[PDB]
Design a protein around this nucleic acid. Structure first.
Lengths: 215, 226
RNA sequence: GGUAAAACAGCCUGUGGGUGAAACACACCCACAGGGCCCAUUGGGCGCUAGCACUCUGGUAUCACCGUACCUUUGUGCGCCUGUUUUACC
């Protein structure tokens, strides 16, 4: 039966300087044939630890691995902002090789309110037939944020989509984009388009807006 | 760095079709190492696919791909391969090749990895994106910094690259994860923040690459006056 | 690698541990279990032999006895073959 590497926790948040512990539990003996990897958004995994407790060359010594029977632990002695990543254990004791489900490590930091910018649709988009209004929430913490679209003071529903960046490797912040999609014929039936943002860094919600045809 | 693994062969493929991925090595000779393939379905974890051992050519396969996939190693080209037949929707993933390092130096750890290549198994057809500007204004200005961007809309499949000023401009850049629209097409936007005083002098150009449709677009993003 | 000089090992079959750019396969090293053949059999020997030296156990011919020569067997040293390792010089 294929060997399973049960990894926990599925995610954690830790403030900078915290000691972080990640645990992997093999379903049967894997001797010491365990590797740990760090994977950053968009990038291939990088090797941190081999043979369960040996530090790969080039890897900062704040990373360390340990073994107790079938329990394997990765430790970060003092979490740094650049340590935001997903971490994976792997067994290389028998085929097929097996990875744990991964652990996404998030940085906890001080509250930061977003900067809020709105972008009216381009002339070039309009004559193709549709209209996108973009609301940009920049460099905020935490990730939770409310984006409300009002068109001539009427709330929108199912008319927008949101995308959120991965945590920033240097300042541990997030950015978000909400884009209101509207047909050209519909876009020209109304004048005011408003992005309304609620966030814990904001003492009261922030509205940015523009009037159609006057951008 | 010194050792590199350079992959190719990815792209859109019909369900039930086939693709061969290549893994070109540099800085070392694949004959002395084990070579592995590991995949990552979008949003998901690493999944080991196959390996090939040195000196014996022994090959090993995950059960999810056994009998459909074939790993091989052309030492005379210093290149490894993965032949993928009868591909299913569940084979969509980023595919990595990885070198298992030398026993005495890194155990059985995978010490070097390819930059990955995406295989989308889909009966849908490829469509290039439309790039629209997101102009800076007083409505994107705050405290001497201004935001401008590019809206990359209505494309398939993933991925698109976006750089700015041919990669001369990197800080302050945010390229957002793509979002899958109800039409079944993707769109994303890339924004950048710049000193507002530079909006008159400096030209900002976003460069959008969508290899599945041969598209390569440079679009200048100039200020509007709100 | 070449040269020179050494060391260690070598009946068969599996098994385990290790090393070789090495998870298996392969090569080599090192152990263990079981087995085979020879002997003078509570034990000892076996890389190979049409040879050599000596010795030893049984024979065969001389042959009154004694003594001699050949065969065989126990070993020892050679001769012959393989594997690995080491040193010096080039």
């Amino acid at each position: 039966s294929d060997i399973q590497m049960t990894q926990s926790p599925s995610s954690l948040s830790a403030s900078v300087g915290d000691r972080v512990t990640i645990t992997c539990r093999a379903s049967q003996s894997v001797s010491s044939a365990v590797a740990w990897y760090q994977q950053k958004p968009g990038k291939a995994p990088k090797l941190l630890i081999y043979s369960a407790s040996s530090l790969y060359s080039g890897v900062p010594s704040r990373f360390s691995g340990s073994r107790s029977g079938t329990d394997f632990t990765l430790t970060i002695s003092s979490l740094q902002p650049e340590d935001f990543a997903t971490y994976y254990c792997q067994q290389s004791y028998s085929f097929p090789s097996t990875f744990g489900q991964g652990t996404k490590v998030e940085i906890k930091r001080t509250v930061a309110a977003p900067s809020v910018f709105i972008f009216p649709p381009s002339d070039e988009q309009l004559k193709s037939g549709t209209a996108s209004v973009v609301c940009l929430l920049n460099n905020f913490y935490p990730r939770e944020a409310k984006v409300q679209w009002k068109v001539d003071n009427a709330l929108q529903s199912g008319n927008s989509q949101e995308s959120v960046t991965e945590q920033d490797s240097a300042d541990s912040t997030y950015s978000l984009s909400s884009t209101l999609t509207l047909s050209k014929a519909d876009y020209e039936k109304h004048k005011v388009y408003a992005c309304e943002v609620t966030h814990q860094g904001l003492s009261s919600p922030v509205t940015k807006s523009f009037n159609r045809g006057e951008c | 760095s010194e050792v590199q693994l350079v992959e190719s062969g990815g792209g859109l493929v019909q369900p039930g079709g086939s693709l061969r991925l290549s893994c070109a090595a540099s800085g070392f000779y694949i004959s002395y190492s084990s070579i592995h393939w590991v995949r990552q379905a979008p949003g998901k974890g690493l999944e080991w696919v196959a390996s090939i051992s040195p000196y014996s050519g022994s090959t090993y396969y995950a059960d999810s791909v056994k009998g459909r996939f074939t790993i091989s190693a052309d030492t005379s080209k210093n290149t490894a391969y993965l032949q993928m037949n009868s591909l299913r929707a569940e084979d969509t993933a980023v595919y990595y090749c990885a070198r298992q390092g030398y026993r005495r130096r890194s155990g059985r750890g995978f010490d070097y990895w390819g930059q990955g290549t995406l295989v989308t198994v889909s009966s849908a057809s490829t469509k290039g994106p439309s790039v629209f500007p997101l102009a800076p204004s007083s409505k994107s200005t705050s405290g001497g910094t201004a935001a401008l961007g590019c809206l990359v809309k209505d494309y398939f499949p993933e991925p698109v690259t976006v750089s700015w000023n041919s990669g001369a401009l990197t800080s302050g850049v945010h390229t957002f994860p793509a979002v899958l629209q109800s039409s079944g097409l993707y769109s994303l936007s890339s924004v950048v923040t710049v000193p507002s005083s530079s909006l008159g002098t400096q030209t900002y150009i976003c460069n959008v690459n969508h290899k599945p449709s041969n598209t390569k677009v440079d679009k200048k993003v100039e200020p509007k006056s709100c």
